[PDB]
Structures are given as structure tokens and as C-alpha cells.
Design a protein around this ligand. Sequence first.
Ligand SMILES: [Cl-]
Ligand SMILES: [Zn+2]
Ligand SMILES: [Zn+2]
Ligand SMILES: [Zn+2]
Length: 96
Amino acid sequence: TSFDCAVCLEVLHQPVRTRCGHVFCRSCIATSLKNNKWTCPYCRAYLPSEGVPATDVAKRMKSEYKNCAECDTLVCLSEMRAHIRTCQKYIDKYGP
Ligand SMILES: [Cl-]
Ligand SMILES: [Zn+2]
Ligand SMILES: [Zn+2]
Ligand SMILES: [Zn+2]
């Protein structure tokens, strides 16, 4: 599915595309590179940088809605991170 992150598996937040064509949350690939420099955490390809903002994916996420996995509220994908931040059922299940 075009809208999940290949490291955390949640709906993408600020999607970034790496030179190898993998798409991750900006913070997810930033933290991966902090620990294991110059490597894609999904396919292990050489990365000279975090990548570029996946503005095609960000655009499409504005016109997509999906149910939160934990409370079933229909949420816009662009706003899903903000939803799970304060979703009590999510917090119940995964912790703060
Ligand atoms: Cl709803
Ligand atoms: Zn992520
Ligand atoms: Zn990759
Ligand atoms: Zn929820």
C-alpha cells in the first residue's frame, strides 16, 4: 500500500523517498541514518542523503481517508499521525 512506511508500518508522516525508491516517514529515515549511515533500512542500498520529500505521495494523501485501526474513526491520511497521537484506543494498545 502506497501510504505506509517501510520502517514503522504506520501511515506515512511527511513521506520521503530515497534514491532507491523506498518511501518512509521523514523522522523514520532520519533516525535510521543516524544509526546506520548511508544505507537504506529496507533494501540496504547506498544512500548519499535522506532522499527527497515525496510530494506526489503527500498530495495523494490529502484525498484519501481510512479508518483508524484502533478506534475505527475515518481519518484523512494526511492527518493520521495527528489522529493516533491522541487516539486513546491507540494509546491503550501501544503505550504512550
Ligand atoms: Cl468518522
Ligand atoms: Zn515511519
Ligand atoms: Zn531502499
Ligand atoms: Zn483512532
